[PDB]
């Protein structure tokens, strides 16, 4: 009772084999376009984050050297002041052309007190 079924039925399974691997062809090109897009997005995100970080790092270092220059402006201010009071010792020490120099004291008392309290 087999006319042509034994050939057309042997053709059916050969048809859905092509269909099933066509389905795998589709899902595989889907996987590679998904991963190719994720690599594309990953590089775009890295480039913009490289942009944001290289702005923060150079804003923070120029702010750091601002603090560093502020320390120099302070230490220079205090060193120039701690020698500014020592310049005043020379206008009293050596000469006033002997006008009326050797009379009394007004600021040498501080230098004398600091020299006495260093007796240790």
């Amino acid at each position: 009772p087999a006319l042509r079924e034994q050939q057309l039925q042997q053709e059916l399974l050969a048809l859905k084999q092509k269909q099933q691997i066509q389905r795998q062809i589709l899902i595989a090109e889907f996987q590679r376009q998904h991963e190719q897009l994720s690599r594309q997005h990953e590089a775009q995100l890295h480039e913009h984050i490289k942009q944001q970080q290289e702005m923060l790092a150079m804003k923070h270092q120029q702010e750091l050297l601002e603090h560093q220059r502020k320390l120099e402006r302070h230490r220079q201010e205090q060193e120039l002041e701690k020698q500014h009071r020592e310049q005043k010792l020379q206008q009293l020490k050596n000469k006033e052309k002997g006008k009326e120099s050797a009379v009394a004291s007004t600021e040498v008392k501080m230098k004398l007190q600091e020299f006495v309290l260093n007796k240790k």
């Binding site: 004291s105 008392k109 004398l112 007190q113 006495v116």
Partner: peptide
């Protein structure tokens, strides 16, 4: 030292 320290004050 005590006399000199007085004189400074």
């Amino acid at each position: 030292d005590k006399v000199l320290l007085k004189y400074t004050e």
